[PDB]
Amino acid sequence: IPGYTYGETENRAPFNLEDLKLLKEAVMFTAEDEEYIQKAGEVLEDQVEEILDTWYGFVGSHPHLLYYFTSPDGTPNEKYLAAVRKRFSRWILDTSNRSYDQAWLDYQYEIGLRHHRTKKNQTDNVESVPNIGYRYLVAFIYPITATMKPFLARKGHTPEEVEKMYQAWFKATTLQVALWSYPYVKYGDF
Amino acid sequence: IPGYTYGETENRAPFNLEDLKLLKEAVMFTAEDEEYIQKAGEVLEDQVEEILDTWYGFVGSHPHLLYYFTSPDGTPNEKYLAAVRKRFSRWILDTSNRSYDQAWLDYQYEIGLRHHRTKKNQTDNVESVPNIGYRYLVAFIYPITATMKPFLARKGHTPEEVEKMYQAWFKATTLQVALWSYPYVKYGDF
Ligand code: HEM
Numbered sequence: 376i377p378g379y380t381y382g383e384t385e386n387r388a389p390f391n392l393e394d395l396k397l398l399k400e401a402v403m404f405t406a407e408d409e410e411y412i413q414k415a416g417e418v419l420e421d422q423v424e425e426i427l428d429t430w431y432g433f434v435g436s437h438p439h440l441l442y443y444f445t446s447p448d449g450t451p452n453e454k455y456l457a458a459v460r461k462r463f464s465r466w467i468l469d470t471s472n473r474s475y476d477q478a479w480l481d482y483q484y485e486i487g488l489r490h491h492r493t494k495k496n497q498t499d500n501v502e503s504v505p506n507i508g509y510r511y512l513v514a515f516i517y518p519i520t521a522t523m524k525p526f527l528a529r530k531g532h533t534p535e536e537v538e539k540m541y542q543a544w545f546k547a548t549t550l551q552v553a554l555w556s557y558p559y560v561k562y563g564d565f
Numbered sequence: 566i567p568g569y570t571y572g573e574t575e576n577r578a579p580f581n582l583e584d585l586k587l588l589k590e591a592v593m594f595t596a597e598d599e600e601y602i603q604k605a606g607e608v609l610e611d612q613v614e615e616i617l618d619t620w621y622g623f624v625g626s627h628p629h630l631l632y633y634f635t636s637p638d639g640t641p642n643e644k645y646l647a648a649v650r651k652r653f654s655r656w657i658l659d660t661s662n663r664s665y666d667q668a669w670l671d672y673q674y675e676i677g678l679r680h681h682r683t684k685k686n687q688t689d690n691v692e693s694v695p696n697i698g699y700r701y702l703v704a705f706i707y708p709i710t711a712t713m714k715p716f717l718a719r720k721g722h723t724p725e726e727v728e729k730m731y732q733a734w735f736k737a738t739t740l741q742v743a744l745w746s747y748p749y750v751k752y753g754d755f
């Protein structure tokens with residue numbers, strides 16, 4: 376997967392495992408959730424293409440959102456959309472498969488950086504808007520959580536198991552957006 | 566309600582109603598949600614005491630969270646908790662009742678400031694930690710949202726009306742934390 380550099384960041388994350396433990400508690404994430412994010416693992420894998428179509432359908436239809444993928448001239452960069460889609464697709468599986476350990480926090484930082492002016496547009500070596508405003512990263516907690524629900528019910532699990540899979544997805548998305556705020560936030564306010 | 570200055574803040578918010586419309590769209594919030602956030606009004610109004618206890622039981626049970634309410638000597642400040650609880654309770658009703666107009670946005674900015682080192686600890690004239698790290702404001706989207714669900718189900722309402730109030734609450738919680746990021750974020754990255 377071009378530009379996907381998990382495990383090989385070259386910068387350690389400015390947040391450690393203790394931060395992650397405390398942030399896990401704040402988000403009500405337990406060993407129960409560890410189990411259930413993995414059940415979402417297997418439920419979502421067959422559907423990843425239809426999931427991405429849904430999200431891209433949402434981004435594409437709102438010009439003020441599609442904007443973050445556009446060449447300086449206002450037109451959407453197809454190459455850029457295509458290349459990010461693959462890493463987004465990977466990220467669904469990563470969220471469900473990976474140990475939330477130091478390597479994982481290393482990539483969280485990496486992902487925060489790439490949304491932010493620090494590294495945005497560098498990975499795919501494109502010319503686009505310098506920065507995605509943090510307001511929209513937070514906003515996206517909703518559609519990224521809520522739209523995953525139907526896809527979790529699909530493969531016919533027990534409604535409780537659906538509900539617990541959704542609940543873990545909600546916690547993990549929230550947890551990650553929270554960490555991705557690091558490059559955006561004033562030093563010492565994070 | 567001491568410290569409650571909704572509608573009377575000076576320093577008018579740095580985001581206007583065009584920003585609020587674009588952020589509403591990012592969180593999938595429509596006139597349908599205004600209706601159902603208003604229906605959360607009456608369901609929740611009775612139970613406000615109970616809800617406050619739930620959120621206080623969560624914060625109070627995690628030292629790294631209760632800490633933001635603590636005197637230099639590391640014990641919780643009873644005056645600080647009591648005054649914030651009164652405003653917090655009122656906020657539930659506000660989220661439900663207030664038109665999301667410019668006076669609403671002005672207070673949103675005030676709320677962001679009171680969590681940030683800019684205006685934290687000044688409202689109730691207390692001595693407490695200088696700043697609530699932003700990471701916890703995002704994380705709290707989860708507990709504020711999910712713990713509200715059981716309360717919406719209590720007034721015996723239809724499961725789909727329950728689902729619609731909950732979705733509205735979730736959208737409205739994310740949207741607000743998103744606006745509160747403003748004082749935390751580096752200039753021009755919001
Ligand atoms: C819940 C919130 C969000 C999630 C879960 C999410 C997820 C992701 C992931 C996994 C990546 C790939 C990281 C990698 O390179 O491995 C990515 C990149 C990207 N996303 Fe987001 N994202 C969110 C918010 C947003 C928002 C609000 C926008 C703007 C509409 C956006 C647009 C982009 C863009 C333009 C990139 C490529 C940035 C670059 O040049 O490196 N994302 N996102």
Ligand code: HEM
Nearest residue numbers: 630633649652653656679685686687688701702705706709
């Ligand atoms: C979804 C996230 C959150 C929501 C919805 C929320 C809600 C509120 C509200 C409505 C107020 C009263 C503001 C006013 O009217 O003056 C307040 C104040 C306060 N909250 Fe939060 N809050 C959140 C995150 C947090 C977190 C993570 C903490 C730390 C554990 C925290 C602790 C406090 C403190 C210490 C104050 C008083 C600050 C001051 O003015 O000195 N809150 N919150």
